[PDB]
Amino acid sequence: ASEKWGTAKPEVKKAMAPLAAGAAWGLEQWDEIAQYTSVMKSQSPDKEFYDAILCLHRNNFKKAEVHIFNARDLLVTELSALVNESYNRAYNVVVRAQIIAELEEIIKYKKLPQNSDKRLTMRETWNTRLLGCQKNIDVWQRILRVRSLVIKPKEDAQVRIKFANLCRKSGRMALAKKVLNTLLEAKASPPVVYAQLKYLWATGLQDEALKQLINFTSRMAHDLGLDVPRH
Numbered sequence: 001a002s003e004k005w006g007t008a009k010p011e012v013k014k015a016m017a018p019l020a021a022g023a024a025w026g027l028e029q030w031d032e033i034a035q036y037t038s039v040m041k042s043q044s045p046d047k048e049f050y051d052a053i054l055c056l057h058r059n060n061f062k063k064a065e066v067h068i069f070n071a072r073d074l075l076v077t078e079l080s081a082l083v084n085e086s087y088n089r090a091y092n093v094v095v096r097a098q099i100i101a102e103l104e105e106i107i108k109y110k111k112l113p114q115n116s117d118k119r120l121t122m123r124e125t126w127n128t129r130l131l132g133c134q135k136n137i138d139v140w141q142r143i144l145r146v147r148s149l150v151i152k153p154k155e156d157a158q159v160r161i162k163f164a165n166l167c168r169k170s171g172r173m174a175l176a177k178k179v180l181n182t183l184l185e186a187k188a189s190p191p192v193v194y195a196q197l198k199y200l201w202a203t204g205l206q207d208e209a210l211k212q213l214i215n216f217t218s219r220m221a222h223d224l225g226l227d228v229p230r231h
Contacts, residue, residue, distance in 0.1 A: 013039050018046045025050070026145075030057050045074060045096075052103060056149065059110060068104060075100070095139055098129070099146060106150050127159060137170050153182060161195050168202050176202075190220065 001020045008016070021036040033054050040047045048071035055064035075097070082093050109122075126147055133139070144163055153160060164179045180199060183192050197216065200209050 014041045017041070018044070018050070021046075021050050025053060030054060043074070045071065048074070049100070053149065056103070056107065061107070061110065064107065068100075068107075071100065095133075098133075099143055102126070102129075102143070103146065106146075109150060130159070135166055135170075137167060137172065137175065140166075141175060157183065157189065157192060161191050164195050165198065168199060 001016070001023060004016065017036050017040040021033055021040065024030070024033045024036060033050065037047060037050060037054065040050075048067060052064060052068050052071070055067065079093060079097070082090055087094075130140070130143070140163060144160075148156065160179065160183055164176065164183065167176050167179060176199060180196055183195055193216070197209075197213060200212075
């Protein structure tokens with residue numbers, strides 16, 4: 001996408017804008033997202049979603065609420081239209097409503113005073129909601145990226161491996177690499193190490209895994225003892 005502006009007439013520009021904005025968010029630089037949202041169309045729920053994303057990144061707490069309320073105003077007509085059919089048809093509406101009401105309490109999480117007391121009863125809400133939602137790779141990675149936009153994956157690594165393992169059971173490669181490289185990025189985090197202990201055999205590199213797993217078991221045994229409580 002770094003090579004379409006010369007013949008990019010304005011309607012094709014507006015066509016390509018949301019995909020390029022999503023690509024820019026995925027590659028995790030935000031300055032160009034301003035330009036792609038500037039060339040983005042006047043009224044589109046993808047634009048309100050991405051605008052809420054950039055507003056969260058630049059952590060305003062004044063007009064992000066106004067924009068997200070405008071999105072609340074736009075959604076209601078299609079909610080009314082898409083309620084009389086089956087729940088299997090309405091599940092897309094359900095999940096987009098879930099994520100868009102998830103990011104408002106994401107915004108609420110940015111409170112000032114101490115940020116060190118509500119961890120006991122509020123971090124696990126997303127975990128329970130995620131486990132309640134059925135296993136789809138696409139929506140799982142989408143809301144995982146949304147969560148990681150505000151929370152540190154290294155300290156959030158208690159569910160990243162639970163993403164990676166079922167990604168492998170689904171049987172896709174690119175997302176598996178894109179998860180395991182970030183999970184790895186020394187000589188710690190034994191579950192994080194065990195992730196690619198599983199994934200190298202999942203690829204089929206077994207002969208090199210032969211001595212590796214034996215050595216790994218050897219120095220876990222040496223760490224624990226040759227022959228805090230929960231930890």
